[PDB]
Amino acid sequence: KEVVVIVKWSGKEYPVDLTDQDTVEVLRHEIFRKTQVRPERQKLLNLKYKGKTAADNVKISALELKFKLMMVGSTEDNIGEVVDDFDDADEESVAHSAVYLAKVQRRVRDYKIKELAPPREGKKLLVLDIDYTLFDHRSPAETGTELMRPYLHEFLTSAYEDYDIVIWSATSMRWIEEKMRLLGVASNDNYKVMFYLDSTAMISVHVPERGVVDVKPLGVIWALYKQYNSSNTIMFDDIRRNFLMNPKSGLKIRPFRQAHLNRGTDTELLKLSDYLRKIAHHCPDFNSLNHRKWEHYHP
């Protein structure tokens, strides 16, 4: 079951953890997770299946034994994501399969959370994406103030009244730390962020009809911090795919693009602060909500 593939890239070795039932496609996604080289940019030099380049659908099981996999490829400020053109808006699931649960458990076992501030009794949990969620990561700008989504700090202060806050970005931890300083979130007098999660906490899951997708599994947090669960957790992300393994707990935020043109009109965070306050005060079980209809929630 448990398998380790050693990948050699750019003069370094990267031990990749997976199982023998994972496919080459999953391997590519785990390689991306380790190296920041995208799956489509990876040339896997010495991975043959019956004398030929193993296809993405080949299970790891069906081949080798100690071995070092040579990968040639490049990783690009073109960081993060801007859209998912294959977003399925139909209102599941492998989100309840053994394979998925085991993937969460491995993150729970191996990923080391660095607590920046402690949980507070009775609070809900808010998880926040960064790119296009809290700021415009695609525009050039001389200051962070210019790229910041309007009402960011007022939104975080309001949320913090009722929610402990976690930041989860599909990027390196370094990028997160840098942007949180740039945006003034890192050290604010009016709120605290509990911890940050990065792309290494994410998992790659095959979703039939769709292929392998990388998601942000709230189950990792829920396993480690048992005071939170789906009944009191909500996540904001502009990319719906990120909550494919916990669809009821995600709210797809409108992306904040081209700050220079839209900074004067964007008020999504103001509106969403109202939403968060209302559900924290009026909804004892968030699973009863339809977040797609958040703008019409008036208890």
Rule CB under 5 A: which residues touch Mg ion?
129, 131-132, 238
Residue positions forming the annotated binding site: 129, 131, 238
Q: Scan for tokens 């559900």, then name that residue.
A: 279
Tokens of 146: 């210019």
Tell me how far the alpha carbon of residue 19 is from its chain's centroid: 22
Q: What is the nearest approach in angstroms of Mg ion to the Cβ of residue 228?
A: 22
Rounded Cα–Cα distance for residues 5 and 223 (Å): 27
Tokens of 101: 């649960």
Residue 73 or 80: which CB sits closer to Mg ion?
80
What lies within 8 Å, CB to CB, of 200 at 6+ separation is 33, 111, 173
- Nearest residue to Mg ion, scored by beta-carbon proximity: 131
Q: What is the nearest approach in angstroms of Mg ion to the Cβ of residue 133?
A: 5
Residue 214 or 238: which CB sits closer to Mg ion?
238
By DSSP bridging, strand 68-72 and strand 43-44 are antiparallel
Q: What is the nearest approach in angstroms of Mg ion to the Cβ of residue 22?
A: 26
Residue 129 or 164: which CB sits closer to Mg ion?
129
Which run of H or E residues covers position 43?
strand 43-44
Rounded Cα–Cα distance for residues 92 and 245 (Å): 9
Residue 16 or 235: which CB sits closer to Mg ion?
235
Residue 123 or 252: which CB sits closer to Mg ion?
252
Q: What is the nearest approach in angstroms of Mg ion to the Cβ of residue 132?
A: 4
What lies within 8 Å, CB to CB, of 107 at 6+ separation is 201, 203, 217, 220
Q: Scan for tokens 């790119």, then name that residue.
A: 131
Tokens of 58: 């080949």
Q: What is the nearest approach in angstroms of Mg ion to the Cβ of residue 284?
A: 29
Residue positions forming the annotated binding site for Mg(2+): 129, 131, 238
One-letter identity of residue 60: I
Residue 8 or 257: which CB sits closer to Mg ion?
257
Do residues 210 and 130 touch, judged by C-beta distance below 8 A?
no
Q: What is the nearest approach in angstroms of Mg ion to the Cβ of residue 237?
A: 6
Rounded Cα–Cα distance for residues 255 and 266 (Å): 10
